[PDB]
Amino acid sequence: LPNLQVALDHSNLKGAITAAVSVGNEVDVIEAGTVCLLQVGSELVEVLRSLFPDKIIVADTKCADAGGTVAKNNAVRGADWMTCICSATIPTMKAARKAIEDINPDKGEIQVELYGDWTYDQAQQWLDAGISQAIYHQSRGEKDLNKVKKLIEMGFRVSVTGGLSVDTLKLFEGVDVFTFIAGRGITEAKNPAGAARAFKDEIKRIWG
Amino acid sequence: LPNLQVALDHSNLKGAITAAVSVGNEVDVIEAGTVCLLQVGSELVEVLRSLFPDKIIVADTKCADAGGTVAKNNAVRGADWMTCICSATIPTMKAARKAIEDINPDKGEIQVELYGDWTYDQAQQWLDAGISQAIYHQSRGEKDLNKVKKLIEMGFRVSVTGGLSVDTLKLFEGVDVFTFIAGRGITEAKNPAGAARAFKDEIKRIWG
Ligand SMILES: O=C(CO)[C@H](O)[C@H](O)COP(=O)(O)O
Protein backbone atom coordinates (compact mmCIF):
# COMPACT_ATOMS: atom_id res chain seq x y z
CA LEU A 1 0.00 0.00 0.00
CA PRO A 2 1.18 3.61 -0.69
CA ASN A 3 2.68 5.17 2.45
CA LEU A 4 1.07 8.24 4.04
CA GLN A 5 3.75 10.89 4.81
CA VAL A 6 3.42 14.21 6.68
CA ALA A 7 5.87 16.99 5.89
CA LEU A 8 6.61 19.41 8.75
CA ASP A 9 7.53 22.69 7.10
CA HIS A 10 6.94 24.85 10.16
CA SER A 11 9.18 27.92 10.75
CA ASN A 12 9.52 26.94 14.40
CA LEU A 13 10.05 23.98 16.70
CA LYS A 14 6.67 23.97 18.48
CA GLY A 15 4.76 23.88 15.18
CA ALA A 16 6.67 20.87 13.91
CA ILE A 17 6.37 18.94 17.21
CA THR A 18 2.67 19.72 17.70
CA ALA A 19 1.62 18.62 14.19
CA ALA A 20 3.83 15.53 14.36
CA VAL A 21 2.23 14.52 17.66
CA SER A 22 -1.29 15.12 16.49
CA VAL A 23 -0.90 13.04 13.29
CA GLY A 24 1.89 10.63 14.19
CA ASN A 25 -0.26 7.53 14.62
CA GLU A 26 -2.32 8.25 11.48
CA VAL A 27 0.72 8.32 9.17
CA ASP A 28 3.47 5.98 8.04
CA VAL A 29 6.32 8.44 7.57
CA ILE A 30 7.23 11.63 9.40
CA GLU A 31 9.24 14.28 7.57
CA ALA A 32 11.27 17.15 9.13
CA GLY A 33 10.85 19.61 6.28
CA THR A 34 13.62 21.78 4.91
CA VAL A 35 12.11 25.12 5.93
CA CYS A 36 11.95 23.66 9.40
CA LEU A 37 15.52 22.25 9.59
CA LEU A 38 16.96 25.55 8.37
CA GLN A 39 15.15 27.22 11.29
CA VAL A 40 15.64 24.82 14.18
CA GLY A 41 18.54 22.60 13.13
CA SER A 42 18.94 18.87 13.46
CA GLU A 43 17.80 18.28 17.04
CA LEU A 44 14.25 18.16 15.66
CA VAL A 45 15.10 14.81 14.09
CA GLU A 46 16.20 13.31 17.36
CA VAL A 47 12.96 14.53 18.98
CA LEU A 48 10.78 12.86 16.28
CA ARG A 49 12.82 9.65 16.71
CA SER A 50 12.16 9.62 20.46
CA LEU A 51 8.42 10.27 20.00
CA PHE A 52 8.10 7.69 17.24
CA PRO A 53 10.72 4.96 17.78
CA ASP A 54 9.08 2.85 15.03
CA LYS A 55 8.00 5.40 12.41
CA ILE A 56 10.11 6.05 9.32
CA ILE A 57 11.72 9.47 9.76
CA VAL A 58 12.76 11.77 6.91
CA ALA A 59 15.39 14.49 7.22
CA ASP A 60 14.45 16.69 4.23
CA THR A 61 17.84 18.38 3.78
CA LYS A 62 17.74 18.65 -0.04
CA CYS A 63 21.47 18.08 0.21
CA ALA A 64 23.45 19.59 -2.68
CA ASP A 65 26.91 18.96 -1.27
CA ALA A 66 29.08 17.58 1.56
CA GLY A 67 26.76 14.60 1.38
CA GLY A 68 28.76 12.39 3.76
CA THR A 69 28.77 15.13 6.36
CA VAL A 70 25.08 16.15 6.04
CA ALA A 71 23.93 12.53 5.76
CA LYS A 72 26.02 11.71 8.84
CA ASN A 73 24.75 14.68 10.86
CA ASN A 74 21.19 13.55 10.37
CA ALA A 75 21.72 9.81 10.66
CA VAL A 76 23.18 10.18 14.19
CA ARG A 77 19.98 12.05 15.00
CA GLY A 78 17.93 9.00 14.03
CA ALA A 79 16.91 9.77 10.43
CA ASP A 80 15.96 6.87 8.14
CA TRP A 81 15.72 8.73 4.80
CA MET A 82 17.52 11.91 3.75
CA THR A 83 16.75 13.97 0.62
CA CYS A 84 19.43 15.10 -1.90
CA ILE A 85 18.50 17.71 -4.49
CA CYS A 86 18.75 16.31 -8.01
CA SER A 87 21.48 18.83 -8.85
CA ALA A 88 23.80 17.13 -6.36
CA THR A 89 26.65 15.38 -8.18
CA ILE A 90 26.81 11.58 -8.20
CA PRO A 91 29.89 11.64 -5.86
CA THR A 92 27.83 13.70 -3.35
CA MET A 93 24.92 11.26 -3.59
CA LYS A 94 27.20 8.28 -3.05
CA ALA A 95 29.01 9.91 -0.13
CA ALA A 96 25.61 10.64 1.39
CA ARG A 97 24.32 7.07 0.78
CA LYS A 98 27.45 5.49 2.20
CA ALA A 99 27.17 7.52 5.46
CA ILE A 100 23.44 6.91 6.06
CA GLU A 101 24.07 3.19 5.44
CA ASP A 102 26.95 3.08 7.91
CA ILE A 103 24.96 4.67 10.77
CA ASN A 104 21.60 3.21 9.81
CA PRO A 105 22.11 -0.20 8.08
CA ASP A 106 18.57 -1.08 8.98
CA LYS A 107 16.75 1.63 6.98
CA GLY A 108 19.23 4.25 5.71
CA GLU A 109 18.38 5.64 2.25
CA ILE A 110 18.69 8.67 0.03
CA GLN A 111 15.71 10.04 -1.88
CA VAL A 112 16.16 12.32 -4.90
CA GLU A 113 14.26 15.60 -4.79
CA LEU A 114 13.11 16.47 -8.36
CA TYR A 115 13.33 20.21 -9.08
CA GLY A 116 13.69 21.92 -12.47
CA ASP A 117 15.03 20.14 -15.55
CA TRP A 118 16.30 16.65 -14.69
CA THR A 119 16.74 13.87 -17.25
CA TYR A 120 16.18 10.14 -17.47
CA ASP A 121 19.93 9.66 -17.95
CA GLN A 122 20.47 11.40 -14.60
CA ALA A 123 17.68 9.19 -13.20
CA GLN A 124 19.63 6.11 -14.44
CA GLN A 125 22.77 7.44 -12.70
CA TRP A 126 21.00 7.68 -9.38
CA LEU A 127 19.90 4.03 -9.75
CA ASP A 128 23.43 2.94 -10.74
CA ALA A 129 24.61 4.71 -7.57
CA GLY A 130 22.38 2.59 -5.27
CA ILE A 131 19.65 5.25 -4.97
CA SER A 132 16.13 4.29 -5.99
CA GLN A 133 13.78 6.78 -4.31
CA ALA A 134 12.68 9.97 -6.04
CA ILE A 135 10.21 12.64 -5.03
CA TYR A 136 8.06 14.13 -7.73
CA HIS A 137 6.57 17.57 -7.08
CA GLN A 138 3.22 18.39 -8.73
CA SER A 139 3.68 21.03 -11.45
CA ARG A 140 2.82 24.70 -10.52
CA GLY A 141 -2.19 16.81 -15.58
CA GLU A 142 -1.02 14.02 -17.87
CA LYS A 143 2.48 15.46 -18.31
CA ASP A 144 3.08 14.74 -14.54
CA LEU A 145 1.48 11.26 -14.39
CA ASN A 146 3.61 10.08 -17.31
CA LYS A 147 6.81 11.21 -15.61
CA VAL A 148 5.68 9.38 -12.44
CA LYS A 149 4.80 6.20 -14.41
CA LYS A 150 8.11 6.24 -16.28
CA LEU A 151 10.16 6.67 -13.08
CA ILE A 152 8.27 3.75 -11.57
CA GLU A 153 8.87 1.71 -14.75
CA MET A 154 12.62 2.44 -14.44
CA GLY A 155 12.77 0.98 -10.91
CA PHE A 156 12.12 3.95 -8.54
CA ARG A 157 9.93 3.90 -5.49
CA VAL A 158 8.24 7.24 -6.34
CA SER A 159 6.81 9.67 -3.74
CA VAL A 160 4.50 12.39 -5.00
CA THR A 161 3.70 15.74 -3.42
CA GLY A 162 2.37 19.27 -3.91
CA GLY A 163 -1.21 20.15 -2.96
CA LEU A 164 -2.94 16.84 -2.25
CA SER A 165 -6.46 16.26 -0.89
CA VAL A 166 -8.37 13.21 0.20
CA ASP A 167 -10.44 13.59 -2.98
CA THR A 168 -7.57 13.92 -5.49
CA LEU A 169 -5.98 10.53 -4.73
CA LYS A 170 -8.26 8.63 -7.12
CA LEU A 171 -6.41 10.51 -9.92
CA PHE A 172 -3.52 8.10 -9.20
CA GLU A 173 -5.57 4.90 -9.39
CA GLY A 174 -3.60 2.02 -10.94
CA VAL A 175 -0.30 3.77 -10.29
CA ASP A 176 2.23 2.03 -7.99
CA VAL A 177 2.90 5.18 -5.95
CA PHE A 178 5.17 4.41 -3.06
CA THR A 179 4.29 7.37 -0.77
CA PHE A 180 1.91 10.29 -0.66
CA ILE A 181 3.39 13.37 0.99
CA ALA A 182 0.78 15.64 2.56
CA GLY A 183 1.91 18.89 4.10
CA ARG A 184 -0.46 21.82 4.60
CA GLY A 185 -3.62 19.73 3.87
CA ILE A 186 -2.89 18.16 7.28
CA THR A 187 -0.74 20.83 9.00
CA GLU A 188 -3.68 23.16 8.72
CA ALA A 189 -6.99 21.53 9.62
CA LYS A 190 -8.49 20.65 12.25
CA ASN A 191 -8.85 17.26 13.57
CA PRO A 192 -5.59 17.01 11.61
CA ALA A 193 -5.58 13.51 13.09
CA GLY A 194 -8.90 12.89 11.30
CA ALA A 195 -7.76 14.69 8.14
CA ALA A 196 -4.84 12.22 8.18
CA ARG A 197 -7.10 9.20 8.74
CA ALA A 198 -9.16 10.52 5.83
CA PHE A 199 -6.08 10.50 3.55
CA LYS A 200 -5.11 7.04 4.79
CA ASP A 201 -8.72 5.79 4.35
CA GLU A 202 -8.82 6.91 0.68
CA ILE A 203 -5.48 5.17 -0.05
CA LYS A 204 -7.02 2.05 1.48
CA ARG A 205 -10.16 2.30 -0.65
CA ILE A 206 -8.12 2.79 -3.82
CA TRP A 207 -5.25 0.31 -3.32
CA GLY A 208 -6.46 -2.20 -0.75
CA LEU B 1 38.73 44.65 -5.22
CA PRO B 2 37.50 41.02 -5.05
CA ASN B 3 35.84 40.27 -1.69
CA LEU B 4 37.19 37.65 0.63
CA GLN B 5 34.44 35.45 2.13
CA VAL B 6 34.79 32.71 4.76
CA ALA B 7 32.39 29.73 4.62
CA LEU B 8 31.46 28.51 8.10
CA ASP B 9 30.73 24.83 7.34
CA HIS B 10 31.08 23.50 10.89
CA SER B 11 28.73 20.84 12.19
CA ASN B 12 28.20 22.65 15.43
CA LEU B 13 27.57 26.13 16.71
CA LYS B 14 30.73 26.51 18.72
CA GLY B 15 32.85 25.75 15.65
CA ALA B 16 31.04 28.38 13.58
CA ILE B 17 31.20 31.10 16.23
CA THR B 18 34.85 30.52 17.11
CA ALA B 19 36.07 30.66 13.52
CA ALA B 20 33.98 33.78 12.84
CA VAL B 21 35.28 35.57 15.92
CA SER B 22 38.87 34.74 15.02
CA VAL B 23 38.87 35.68 11.32
CA GLY B 24 36.00 38.16 11.08
CA ASN B 25 38.07 41.33 10.78
CA GLU B 26 40.28 39.77 8.11
CA VAL B 27 37.29 39.06 5.72
CA ASP B 28 34.71 41.08 3.81
CA VAL B 29 31.82 38.62 3.95
CA ILE B 30 30.87 36.02 6.60
CA GLU B 31 28.85 32.98 5.40
CA ALA B 32 26.79 30.68 7.55
CA GLY B 33 27.20 27.51 5.53
CA THR B 34 24.50 25.03 4.65
CA VAL B 35 26.05 22.20 6.70
CA CYS B 36 26.01 24.50 9.67
CA LEU B 37 22.47 25.89 9.25
CA LEU B 38 21.06 22.39 8.84
CA GLN B 39 22.68 21.64 12.24
CA VAL B 40 22.07 24.69 14.38
CA GLY B 41 19.22 26.50 12.58
CA SER B 42 19.02 30.18 11.75
CA GLU B 43 19.81 31.64 15.17
CA LEU B 44 23.44 31.41 14.05
CA VAL B 45 22.72 34.21 11.57
CA GLU B 46 21.41 36.49 14.35
CA VAL B 47 24.51 35.96 16.52
CA LEU B 48 26.82 36.61 13.61
CA ARG B 49 24.87 39.81 12.89
CA SER B 50 25.21 40.79 16.51
CA LEU B 51 28.95 39.97 16.43
CA PHE B 52 29.45 41.95 13.20
CA PRO B 53 26.91 44.79 12.84
CA ASP B 54 28.33 46.01 9.47
CA LYS B 55 29.82 42.95 7.75
CA ILE B 56 28.01 41.31 4.85
CA ILE B 57 26.52 38.03 6.12
CA VAL B 58 25.44 35.14 3.96
CA ALA B 59 22.78 32.59 4.89
CA ASP B 60 23.77 29.64 2.70
CA THR B 61 20.40 27.93 2.54
CA LYS B 62 20.55 26.66 -1.06
CA CYS B 63 16.83 27.22 -1.00
CA ALA B 64 14.99 25.09 -3.54
CA ASP B 65 11.49 26.04 -2.56
CA ALA B 66 9.21 28.10 -0.30
CA GLY B 67 11.57 30.93 -1.26
CA GLY B 68 9.47 33.58 0.47
CA THR B 69 9.42 31.76 3.78
CA VAL B 70 13.09 30.77 3.78
CA ALA B 71 14.28 34.23 2.68
CA LYS B 72 12.15 35.96 5.33
CA ASN B 73 13.19 33.54 8.05
CA ASN B 74 16.83 34.39 7.41
CA ALA B 75 16.35 38.09 6.71
CA VAL B 76 14.67 38.78 10.07
CA ARG B 77 17.76 37.20 11.60
CA GLY B 78 19.91 39.81 9.83
CA ALA B 79 21.11 38.05 6.65
CA ASP B 80 22.16 40.29 3.74
CA TRP B 81 22.50 37.63 1.03
CA MET B 82 20.79 34.24 0.66
CA THR B 83 21.62 31.44 -1.75
CA CYS B 84 19.00 29.69 -3.93
CA ILE B 85 20.07 26.44 -5.69
CA CYS B 86 20.02 26.89 -9.47
CA SER B 87 17.26 24.23 -9.76
CA ALA B 88 14.76 26.25 -7.77
CA THR B 89 12.08 27.60 -10.09
CA ILE B 90 12.00 31.29 -11.13
CA PRO B 91 8.84 31.99 -9.03
CA THR B 92 10.70 30.50 -6.04
CA MET B 93 13.65 32.79 -6.79
CA LYS B 94 11.36 35.80 -7.26
CA ALA B 95 9.51 35.13 -3.97
CA ALA B 96 12.88 34.87 -2.20
CA ARG B 97 14.19 38.07 -3.71
CA LYS B 98 11.06 40.02 -2.82
CA ALA B 99 11.11 38.85 0.81
CA ILE B 100 14.79 39.70 1.35
CA GLU B 101 14.42 43.18 -0.24
CA ASP B 102 11.29 43.76 1.74
CA ILE B 103 13.11 43.24 5.08
CA ASN B 104 16.63 44.34 4.00
CA PRO B 105 16.16 47.07 1.39
CA ASP B 106 19.77 48.25 1.69
CA LYS B 107 21.84 45.10 1.12
CA GLY B 108 19.26 42.33 0.52
CA GLU B 109 20.03 39.98 -2.37
CA ILE B 110 19.75 36.43 -3.69
CA GLN B 111 22.72 34.41 -4.97
CA VAL B 112 22.39 31.49 -7.35
CA GLU B 113 24.36 28.38 -6.35
CA LEU B 114 25.47 26.59 -9.53
CA TYR B 115 25.34 22.85 -9.23
CA GLY B 116 24.77 20.19 -11.94
CA ASP B 117 23.67 21.02 -15.51
CA TRP B 118 22.40 24.62 -15.52
CA THR B 119 22.00 26.67 -18.74
CA TYR B 120 22.90 30.19 -19.92
CA ASP B 121 19.20 30.58 -20.68
CA GLN B 122 18.42 29.70 -17.06
CA ALA B 123 21.22 32.17 -16.21
CA GLN B 124 19.51 34.88 -18.31
CA GLN B 125 16.20 34.02 -16.66
CA TRP B 126 17.77 34.78 -13.25
CA LEU B 127 18.95 38.22 -14.44
CA ASP B 128 15.45 38.98 -15.72
CA ALA B 129 14.07 38.04 -12.32
CA GLY B 130 16.37 40.76 -11.01
CA ILE B 131 18.97 38.38 -9.62
CA SER B 132 22.58 39.10 -10.53
CA GLN B 133 24.87 37.01 -8.30
CA ALA B 134 26.02 33.48 -9.02
CA ILE B 135 28.41 31.30 -7.12
CA TYR B 136 30.54 29.02 -9.23
CA HIS B 137 32.21 25.86 -7.86
CA GLN B 138 35.58 24.40 -8.99
CA SER B 139 35.01 20.94 -10.60
CA ARG B 140 36.19 17.62 -8.96
CA GLY B 141 41.35 24.48 -15.21
CA GLU B 142 40.53 26.53 -18.36
CA LYS B 143 37.00 25.07 -18.63
CA ASP B 144 36.17 26.57 -15.20
CA LEU B 145 37.85 29.92 -15.87
CA ASN B 146 35.92 30.23 -19.10
CA LYS B 147 32.55 29.62 -17.47
CA VAL B 148 33.31 32.35 -14.92
CA LYS B 149 34.21 34.88 -17.66
CA LYS B 150 31.03 34.19 -19.58
CA LEU B 151 28.95 34.63 -16.41
CA ILE B 152 30.74 37.93 -15.64
CA GLU B 153 30.18 38.94 -19.24
CA MET B 154 26.40 38.31 -19.00
CA GLY B 155 26.28 40.77 -16.07
CA PHE B 156 26.58 38.57 -12.96
CA ARG B 157 28.81 39.35 -10.04
CA VAL B 158 30.34 35.83 -9.88
CA SER B 159 31.65 34.31 -6.62
CA VAL B 160 34.22 31.49 -7.00
CA THR B 161 34.76 28.72 -4.51
CA GLY B 162 35.94 25.09 -4.11
CA GLY B 163 39.23 24.09 -2.48
CA LEU B 164 40.70 27.55 -2.93
CA SER B 165 44.29 27.81 -1.83
CA VAL B 166 45.82 31.31 -1.71
CA ASP B 167 48.39 30.02 -4.18
CA THR B 168 45.64 29.69 -6.77
CA LEU B 169 44.21 33.21 -7.03
CA LYS B 170 46.92 34.06 -9.61
CA LEU B 171 45.16 31.95 -12.23
CA PHE B 172 42.22 34.44 -12.09
CA GLU B 173 44.30 37.56 -12.83
CA GLY B 174 42.51 40.17 -14.95
CA VAL B 175 39.23 38.26 -14.30
CA ASP B 176 36.65 40.47 -12.59
CA VAL B 177 35.86 37.97 -9.76
CA PHE B 178 33.43 39.56 -7.33
CA THR B 179 34.16 37.35 -4.28
CA PHE B 180 36.40 34.40 -3.43
CA ILE B 181 34.89 32.06 -0.94
CA ALA B 182 37.33 30.18 1.22
CA GLY B 183 36.17 27.49 3.62
CA ARG B 184 38.75 24.91 4.74
CA GLY B 185 41.76 26.95 3.58
CA ILE B 186 40.80 29.48 6.29
CA THR B 187 38.84 27.38 8.79
CA GLU B 188 41.28 24.44 9.04
CA ALA B 189 44.50 26.38 8.55
CA LYS B 190 46.75 26.35 11.56
CA ASN B 191 46.67 30.16 11.67
CA PRO B 192 43.08 30.93 10.56
CA ALA B 193 43.44 34.70 11.13
CA GLY B 194 46.82 34.63 9.34
CA ALA B 195 45.46 32.46 6.48
CA ALA B 196 42.63 34.93 5.91
CA ARG B 197 45.19 37.75 5.76
CA ALA B 198 47.34 35.74 3.34
CA PHE B 199 44.23 35.48 1.13
CA LYS B 200 43.16 39.16 1.13
CA ASP B 201 46.83 40.29 0.81
CA GLU B 202 47.34 38.08 -2.26
CA ILE B 203 44.13 39.59 -3.64
CA LYS B 204 45.58 43.03 -2.93
CA ARG B 205 48.64 42.46 -5.12
CA ILE B 206 46.87 40.82 -8.06
CA TRP B 207 43.84 43.16 -8.41
CA GLY B 208 43.41 46.85 -7.62
O1 LIG C 1 30.48 25.37 1.19
C1 LIG C 1 30.56 24.71 0.15
C2 LIG C 1 29.50 23.69 -0.18
O2 LIG C 1 28.43 24.38 -0.84
C3 LIG C 1 31.73 25.01 -0.77
O3 LIG C 1 32.41 23.87 -1.32
C4 LIG C 1 32.65 25.75 0.18
O4 LIG C 1 32.12 27.06 0.27
C5 LIG C 1 34.07 25.83 -0.30
O5 LIG C 1 34.79 25.58 0.88
P1 LIG C 1 36.21 24.87 0.68
O6 LIG C 1 37.10 26.07 0.44
O7 LIG C 1 36.43 24.09 1.97
O8 LIG C 1 36.04 23.98 -0.54
TrEMBL record, chains A, B:
Any GO molecular function: metal ion binding
Pathway in which the depicted protein is active: One-carbon metabolism; formaldehyde assimilation via RuMP pathway; D-fructose 6-phosphate from D-ribulose 5-phosphate and formaldehyde: step 1/2
Pfam families: OMPdecase
Residues the entry annotates as binding Mg(2+): E31, D60, E113
The EC number(s) this enzyme carries: 4.1.2.43
Binding sites annotated in the UniProt record for D-ribulose 5-phosphate: K62, G163, G183, R184
Superkingdom to which the source organism belongs: Bacteria
GO biological process, any: 'de novo' pyrimidine nucleobase biosynthetic process
Domain Orotidine 5'-phosphate decarboxylase: 3-199
Family: Belongs to the HPS/KGPDC family. HPS subfamily.
Name this protein carries in UniProt: 3-hexulose-6-phosphate synthase
Source species of the chain: Streptococcus mutans
Name of the gene encoding the protein in the UniProt record: rmpD
